[PDB]
Design a protein around this ligand. Structure first.
Ligand SMILES: O=C(O)c1ccc(S)nc1C(=O)O
Ligand code: SF4
Ligand SMILES: [Cl-]
Length: 301
């Protein structure tokens, strides 16, 4: 690890790579990254860079997001199989089926979606902006995927009708038990519970705050509470504890995204040695997927 970390830092400098790491990476990889953040934060950061080579540490749809918004940069990932099972359950066939049945409902796709699915979306959204995006659409009905929990949250906050696809679209990592909140309230009476909107409704409704990872790291800037209980993937505990060393961050439960943990010091070192595996999308996919991303930027403009 001493070897691997030094060799990584050496090869990144030597070959002109910037390392971008998602919040759900292992701490060792967060610590060697130039920037750690959420998928949109990392894509927007990449647009600002003078460097034309990126080593991306996350899962495929996010690396592809970076590539869509930075087509002329070389983007490589250490494990080409790192993917989002939830994203992968939504298909072009299901989107087209639902557009045909509800032709007046805009297709709002969570950024946790395949690039192919993005080519068919009317607008992209993040967990932070989903409510605001859906509020600003003309329609009082939207098609939303692939996360049924976030879709239902959006319906609650907007009062709009949200038709969720696919059937039972969810993120296994965020299926905490509401009983975990009951238990931490007893154990740390003054702790603030922050959970993800991908969490099920009973968990959301028992939390002090519901928010994206990006929103979670901003809450201690306005809430002086000593202890925060965190209902997301375990990588966020490391991120939060680094940003706010003066507070305590307690996992609601241990929750690990197996795909996020496919990236390691070893295979990150192999990626810089070989300059593989490059993220390549057909130009047509990039052009089409860009349209609902730009719409998102326009709506949040
Ligand atoms: O930031 C978020 O809340 C979030 C949660 C899960 C996953 S895979 N990604 C993200 C994100 O980068 O937006
Ligand atoms: S944490 Fe959930 S939403 Fe994020 S990549 Fe892993 S399975 Fe997909
Ligand atoms: Cl570019």
């Amino acid at each position: 690890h001493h070897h691997m970390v030094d060799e990584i830092l050496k090869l990144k400098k030597e070959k002109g790579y910037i390392i971008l790491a998602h919040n759900f990476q292992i701490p060792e990889l967060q610590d060697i990254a130039d920037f750690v953040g959420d998928s949109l934060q990392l894509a927007r950061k990449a647009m600002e860079l003078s460097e034309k080579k990126i080593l991306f540490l996350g899962v495929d749809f996010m690396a592809e997001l970076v590539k869509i918004l930075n087509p002329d940069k070389k983007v490589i990932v250490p494990d080409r199989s790192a993917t989002c099972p939830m994203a992968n359950r939504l298909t072009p066939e299901i989107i087209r089926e639902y557009r045909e049945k509800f032709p007046d409902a805009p297709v709002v796709l969570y950024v946790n979606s395949t690039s192919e699915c993005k080519t068919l979306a009317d607008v992209i959204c993040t967990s932070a902006n989903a409510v605001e995006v859906v509020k600003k659409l003309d329609s009082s009905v939207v098609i939303f995927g692939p996360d049924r929990n976030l879709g239902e949250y959006v319906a609650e906050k907007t009062g709009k009708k949200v038709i969720t696809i696919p059937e039972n679209g969810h993120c296994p990592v965020h299926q905490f038990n509401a009983e975990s909140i009951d238990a931490v309230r007893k154990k740390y009476p003054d702790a603030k519970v922050i959970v993800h909107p991908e969490c099920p409704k009973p968990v959301r409704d028992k939390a002090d705050y519901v928010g994206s990872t990006g929103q979670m790291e901003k809450i201690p800037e306005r809430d002086p509470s000593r202890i925060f209980v965190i209902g997301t993937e375990i990588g966020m505990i490391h991120k939060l504890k680094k940003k706010f060393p003066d507070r305590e961050f307690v996992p609601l439960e241990m929750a690990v995204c197996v795909n996020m943990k496919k990236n390691t010091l070893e295979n990150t070192l192999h990626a810089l040695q070989t300059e593989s595996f490059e993220v390549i999308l057909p130009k047509e996919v990039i052009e089409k997927a860009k349209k609902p991303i730009l719409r998102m930027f326009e709506l949040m403009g």
